[PDB]
Design a protein around this ligand. Structure first.
Ligand SMILES: NS(=O)(=O)c1nnc(-c2ccccc2Cl)s1
Ligand SMILES: [Zn+2]
Length: 257
């Protein structure tokens, strides 16, 4: 029932998911001046060399690329994290125009889109168990701005026409997510939540300072996807982002000066 429209969007979510008004909700505005540099923070460790992508899927709210998470093949650790987190999927949030689309904001600035690489803490055995724990997930967030193309994103955008509508999926093997990372792994981090229902407060957010650049043609292909299923009135999948939520009792830490 939930979505991003006037009658079922983010302002409505608390009715089915009361935690929407909780104490550690995401996304948030990252005030860069107030975020404190924490010299105790370690470099992020991103080990994606053995990543195995499986399928790409339009789930009615975004599109996602899903990985084999049955072994430690693609893992996140270090940074603010204790232990090892397995990559299960990545997806995007984007706007109807280039001046909006990201979920997190930086000094109130919105990016055209935001990439989320979702990982779960292996000590909990599976994603379903992990989301019920305050340190169950680590989501790596990467901003997208419009300019030069990102060659590593092209194999993704070229297949989107085959998953136009809700519930469509396709084989998507041998995709290398290293091709979506910016040069620097400098990051902000804070305790937060899933940004879609069920909005569980299970996420250590790690948001990279450096955005990746994608081309207008690449983002344009995102905007041709549909929220609706095949045979329903066509509603473009655009503006599938939750706005910034109250920071409340939280400190955002920076890994860099
Ligand atoms: N946008 S996000 O990465 O915070 C995210 N929000 N919800 C996610 C989710 C929802 C339902 C089941 C499993 C997952 Cl991983 S992932
Ligand atoms: Zn997301």
């Amino acid at each position: 029932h939930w979505g991003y429209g006037k009658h079922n969007g983010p302002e409505h979510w608390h009715k089915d998911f009361p935690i929407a008004k909780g104490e550690r909700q995401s996304p948030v505005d990252i005030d860069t001046h107030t975020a404190k540099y924490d010299p105790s923070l370690k470099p992020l460790s991103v080990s994606y060399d053995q990543a195995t992508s499986l399928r790409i899927l339009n789930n009615g709210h975004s599109f996602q690329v899903t990985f084999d998470d049955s072994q430690d093949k693609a893992v996140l650790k270090g940074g603010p994290l204790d232990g090892t987190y397995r990559l299960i999927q990545f997806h995007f949030h984007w706007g109807s125009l280039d001046g909006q689309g990201s979920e997190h904001t930086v000094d109130k600035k919105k990016y055209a889109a935001e990439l989320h690489l979702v990982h779960w803490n292996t000590k909990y055995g599976d994603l379903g168990k992990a989301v019920q724990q305050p340190d169950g997930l680590a989501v790596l967030g990467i901003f997208l701005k419009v300019g030069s193309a990102k060659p590593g994103l092209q194999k993704v955008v070229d297949v989107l026409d085959s998953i136009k509508t809700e519930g469509k999926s396709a084989d998507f093997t041998n995709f290398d997510p290293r091709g979506l990372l910016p040069e620097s792994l400098d990051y902000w981090t804070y305790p937060g939540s899933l940004t879609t229902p069920p909005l569980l407060e299970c996420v250590t957010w790690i948001v990279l300072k450096e955005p990746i650049s994608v081309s207008s043609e690449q983002v344009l292909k995102f905007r041709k996807l549909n929220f609706n299923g095949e045979g329903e009135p066509e509603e473009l999948m655009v503006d599938n982002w939750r706005p910034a939520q109250p920071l409340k009792n939280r400190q955002i830490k920076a890994s860099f000066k």
